[PDB]
């Protein structure tokens, strides 16, 4: 249950928080990147697809599977205006 999210960075950013990463497990056993908060009115909220508990697979060209929090944050912030997110939905 992989879905694609194409978004446009608003002024306040992409409008979501992440947790997770190798050395920073969000779920015991899981090194994956996870969305923990969708900020009201932000890019992500207005698009409506992204959801808390979503796992980030890729952002643009940068795969996010088995990486450090800080690598994920860096890649998520190295983004232009146009953002492609590849996500997996829970369970």
């Amino acid at each position: 249950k992989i879905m694609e999210i194409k978004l446009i960075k608003g002024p306040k950013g992409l409008g979501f928080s992440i947790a997770g990463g190798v050395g920073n497990q969000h779920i015991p056993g899981d090194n994956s990147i996870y969305v923990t908060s969708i900020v009201e009115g932000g890019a992500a909220h207005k698009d409506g697809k992204l959801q808390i508990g979503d796992k980030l697979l890729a952002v643009n060209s940068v795969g996010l599977e088995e990486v450090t929090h800080e690598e994920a944050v860096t890649a998520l912030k190295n983004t232009s205006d146009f953002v492609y997110l590849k996500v997996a939905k829970p369970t």
């Binding site: 992409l14 928080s17 994920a72 998520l76």
Partner: peptide, 4 residues
């Protein structure tokens, strides 16, 4: 929990 990074906000971006």
């Amino acid at each position: 929990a990074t906000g971006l």
